[PDB]
Design a protein around this ligand. Structure first.
Ligand SMILES: COc1ccc(S(=O)(=O)N(CC(C)C)C[C@@H](O)[C@H](Cc2ccccc2)NC(=O)O[C@H]2CO[C@H]3O[C@@H]4OCC[C@@H]4[C@H]32)cc1
Ligand SMILES: [Cl-]
Ligand SMILES: [Cl-]
Ligand code: NA
Lengths: 99, 99
């Protein structure tokens, strides 16, 4: 689709068998989801933002369905105030900014 | 232009006669710039992200060029880690997300 930016670009995602709402976020290098369980191995990471850093768990090779499009990549899980789809998975669904 | 997201979507902006680099950020409601002097009065605002909240100075009706497109609108000034162009000015330059 083409999504205008009058409102937050929120979409439905499926991750870990769960449906969630998430922000399509071109200012995010990585995908960061609120606390949930994911299978397999993980390692700790710190990620920064406007107001400092949070500690997250980094899971690699996770499949997510984003507004109907499947993609695979790293997902960070931790106390983010919003679920964010960052550039590592936006590229995979072929998202671009146009003006 | 059509901007892919394999790299950060950094563009050149011009504000107060100076050039700066900024991120086109669909996950940001608000444009937030690092400390600089702007004319006129400002109003307080608290914004929040990953890590938590920060206090910023809100300047309204500021002239700013973004990737060669003129915008005139609200700019928040504060301790953001990077200059961010949010939806309030992305809409003024005609930006959409597409996939
Ligand atoms: C390494 O991978 C990462 C690293 C950092 C981040 S981030 O969330 O800190 N952020 C990076 C950016 C500051 C360079 C992505 C942004 O899109 C966040 C994404 C974000 C959204 C909401 C809450 C937390 C984060 N937006 C944001 O901070 O917006 C601020 C400014 O305007 C307001 O609009 C937003 O909505 C109201 C609050 C925020 C305020 C994500 C993945
Ligand atoms: Cl990845
Ligand atoms: Cl591509
Ligand atoms: Na894994």
């Amino acid at each position: 689709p083409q999504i205008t930016l009058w409102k937050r670009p929120l979409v439905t995602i499926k991750i870990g068998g769960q449906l969630k709402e998430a922000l399509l976020d071109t200012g995010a290098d990585n995908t960061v989801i609120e606390e949930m369980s994911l299978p397999g191995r993980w390692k700790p990471k710190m990620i920064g933002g406007i107001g400092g850093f949070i500690k997250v768990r980094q899971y690699d090779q996770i499949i997510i369905e984003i507004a109907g499009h499947k993609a695979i990549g790293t997902v960070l899980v931790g106390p983010t105030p919003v679920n964010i789809i960052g550039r590592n998975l936006l590229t995979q669904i072929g998202a671009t900014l146009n003006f």
